[PDB]
């Protein structure tokens, strides 16, 4: 047919149909939006995770720079 019937309008009924397409994609949009964003949450997390331990794991550990020990070295004293 010449684009739907003619007497009626098929515009109103079609208007609702189009909404579904737009809505069906908006629903899937959200799901896929997390699929692409979640792929980063891991590194984004692992990123701030290293910056958190690195500090507590460096802002108070100057023994390594020395060698691998400090006290517990009981032995012949002197000075």
């Amino acid at each position: 047919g010449a684009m739907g019937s003619k007497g009626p309008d098929i515009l109103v009924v079609l208007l609702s149909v189009m909404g579904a397409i737009l809505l069906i994609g908006l629903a899937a949009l959200l799901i896929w939006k997390l699929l692409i964003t979640i792929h980063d949450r891991k590194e984004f997390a692992k990123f701030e995770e290293e910056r958190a331990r690195a500090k507590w794991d460096t802002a108070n550990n100057p023994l390594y720079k020395e060698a691998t020990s400090t006290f517990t070295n009981i032995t012949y004293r002197g000075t």
């Binding site: 009924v13 149909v17 069906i24 949009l29 692409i36 964003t37």
Partner: protein
């Protein structure tokens, strides 16, 4: 005539054909959003040269 619609039938085919294209839209949308993030990292302007640093 006005509120009444003598077409009491609501042809689902029409809805189906539209919902069918919604799968077609679902895919182009899914890609376009995927692009809104998958085309971002494809950084084609020579960004970080050697490893990461400065």
């Amino acid at each position: 005539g006005a509120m009444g619609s003598e077409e009491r039938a609501i042809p689902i085919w029409w809805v189906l054909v539209g919902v069918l294209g919604g799968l077609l839209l679902l895919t182009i949308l899914v890609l376009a959003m995927w692009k809104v993030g998958f085309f971002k990292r494809n950084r084609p302007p020579l960004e970080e040269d050697d490893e990461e640093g400065e």
